[PDB]
Amino acid sequence: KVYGRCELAAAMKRLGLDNYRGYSLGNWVCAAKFESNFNTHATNRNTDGSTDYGILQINSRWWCNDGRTPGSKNLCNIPCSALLSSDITASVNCAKKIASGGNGMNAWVAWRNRCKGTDVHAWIRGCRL
Ligand SMILES: CC(=O)N[C@@H]1[C@@H](O)[C@H](O[C@@H]2O[C@H](CO)[C@@H](O)[C@H](O)[C@H]2NC(C)=O)[C@@H](CO)O[C@@H]1O
């Protein structure tokens, strides 16, 4: 599914991401735009053999198990295929676990390069939430 910007914002708001660990809703919408262009089916392989899955490009080395990654820690206790669903529940529940690490949302490389520090509140402007 390719989400629209305000459609995704509303889905994320109903799952408790607004102001989760200090981060306003626009941070998560910005992270999903630069990680996957709002595409639930996005995947990218990493050099080490893990793959990043779904709308938030969560990797299989630490977070989900895809079968193909030797020594996946699977900290979110989910198969990586669950992150490819049009339903984003599993992706946001896992995202909350990774944003609980010491560097918070800096675990999303696209967020730290293209979103961090900017007026991220713009990403939810005009959405009826
Ligand atoms: C939360 C999450 O999974 N974010 C992804 C990053 O982890 C990806 O970064 C890359 O991750 C692998 C697995 O740890 C590292 O081997 C790799 O070096 C690292 N790459 C970079 C440039 O940091 C990232 C890949 O674009 O995608 C999500 O942000």
Side-chain angles (χ1 to χ4, degrees):
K1 174 171 171 58
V2 176
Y3 274 81
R5 179 182 57 89
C6 289
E7 184 188 19
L8 212 229
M12 289 183 151
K13 178 166 182 75
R14 294 180 237 111
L15 289 165
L17 280 178
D18 199 8
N19 292 121
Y20 182 79
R21 292 190 120 244
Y23 299 100
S24 67
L25 223 203
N27 282 289
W28 301 95
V29 182
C30 190
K33 194 267 170 179
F34 283 104
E35 283 297 351
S36 67
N37 195 213
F38 301 138
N39 197 150
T40 260
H41 291 168
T43 61
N44 279 281
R45 275 185 282 231
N46 302 302
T47 311
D48 71 298
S50 63
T51 299
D52 311 298
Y53 293 88
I55 203 162
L56 280 175
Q57 292 287 287
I58 289 173
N59 75 68
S60 67
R61 173 181 183 207
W62 299 109
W63 304 113
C64 65
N65 187 11
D66 57 1
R68 174 178 83 165
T69 304
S72 172
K73 199 161 180 48
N74 192 197
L75 264 356
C76 289
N77 289 299
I78 206 87
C80 297
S81 53
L83 278 34
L84 265 18
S85 303
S86 53
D87 188 319
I88 68 168
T89 300
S91 290
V92 314
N93 284 338
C94 186
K96 292 179 181 175
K97 185 144 180 46
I98 92 107
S100 300
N103 69 358
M105 285 189 78
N106 292 109
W108 283 280
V109 171
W111 174 86
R112 57 136 50 234
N113 297 150
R114 310 297 294 272
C115 305
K116 182 189 184 174
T118 73
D119 178 23
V120 103
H121 298 184
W123 287 96
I124 58 169
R125 172 203 307 274
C127 300
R128 292 301 112 219
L129 299 174

